[PDB]
Design a protein around this ligand. Structure first.
Ligand SMILES: CC(C)(Sc1ccc(CCN(CCCCC2CCCCC2)C(=O)NC2CCCCC2)cc1)C(=O)O
Length: 258
């Protein structure tokens, strides 16, 4: 692994630590105290301390808070993408397409860092929602998070650190086979450079697992399918729930996606 490829992996890693408020090391520290949301009583208590200004059904209030975090994460991923060699040199329209299809694959990948089998760290490290509370919400809102917990438990078993995850997220953003891409050839070259660094980095950082790279390629495919199914559930909610309107930035991300 040349000093240049180590520099690329380090640049990506530092751009990850700079652009995302929560990293896996800090998440594990806290998860090892945040306010525990495990029932309706504690949800209301958390709302008054953590999202005071926020009345509708609990399920709808939660859904709105979730939208706020997604808008924030999309903004963070947008600045992170600049660290990827060649991304800023891409056509402005291609940069939008890559981020459009990539953001939620990256969101659910990064969500794993703050999940354990019993729940998830939320609200900038200050809350912890239980997995069972989320399952207790009325349909269809109880169906949103459980497939993400399912993915995260397998993803977390790979025992990646943020030096790996930063490259993985970069690779997700660099997928050349997104619909609507103009300069597909340059994107594939850009993807190839990130994937090449990821492969060498995993060999260096995880010599114990000789299959980690193909394992992560499969997780990228799993995430694409997870996002397809997520978008389908979001469309049902928007259509069936006469009070869960979508933030405009998010509605534009899902527009014409799948
Ligand atoms: C909003 C849809 C329509 S569905 C959707 C999408 C994503 C999520 C996960 C949101 N979340 C819980 C945010 C929980 C907020 C908490 C609720 C209880 C009261 C206190 C505040 C969270 O922590 N996300 C992390 C953010 C850091 C980076 C990684 C992801 C939930 C639903 C969308 O598609 O965007």
């Amino acid at each position: 692994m040349t000093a240049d490829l180590k520099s690329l992996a380090k640049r990506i890693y530092e751009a990850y630590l700079k652009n995302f408020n929560m990293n896996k090391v800090k998440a594990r520290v806290i998860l090892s105290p945040p306010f525990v949301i495990h029932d309706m009583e504690t949800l209301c208590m958390a709302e008054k301390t953590l999202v005071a200004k926020l009345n509708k059904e609990a399920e709808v209030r939660i859904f709105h808070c979730c939208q706020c975090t997604s808008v924030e994460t999309v903004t963070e991923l947008t600045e992170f993408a600049k660290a990827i060699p060649g991304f800023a040199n891409l056509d402005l329209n291609d940069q939008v397409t890559l981020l459009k299809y990539g953001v939620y694959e990256a969101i659910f990948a990064m969500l794993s860092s703050v999940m354990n089998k019993d729940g998830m760290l939320v609200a900038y490290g200050n809350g912890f929602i239980t997995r069972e509370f989320l399952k207790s919400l009325r349909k269809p809102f109880c169906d949103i998070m459980e497939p993400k917990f399912d993915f995260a438990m397998k993803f977390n078993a790979l025992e990646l650190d943020d030096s790996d995850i930063s490259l993985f997220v970069a690779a997700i953003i660099c997928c050349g086979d997104r619909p609507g891409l103009l300069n597909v050839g340059h994107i594939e070259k850009m993807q190839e450079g990130i994937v090449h660094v990821l492969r060498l980095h995993l060999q260096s950082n995880h010599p114990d697992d000789i299959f980690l790279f193909p394992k992560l390629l499969q997780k990228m495919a799993d995430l694409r399918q997870l996002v397809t199914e997520h978008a389908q559930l979001v469309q049902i909610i928007k259509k069936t729930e006469s009070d869960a309107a979508l933030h405009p930035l998010l509605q534009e991300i899902y527009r014409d996606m799948y």
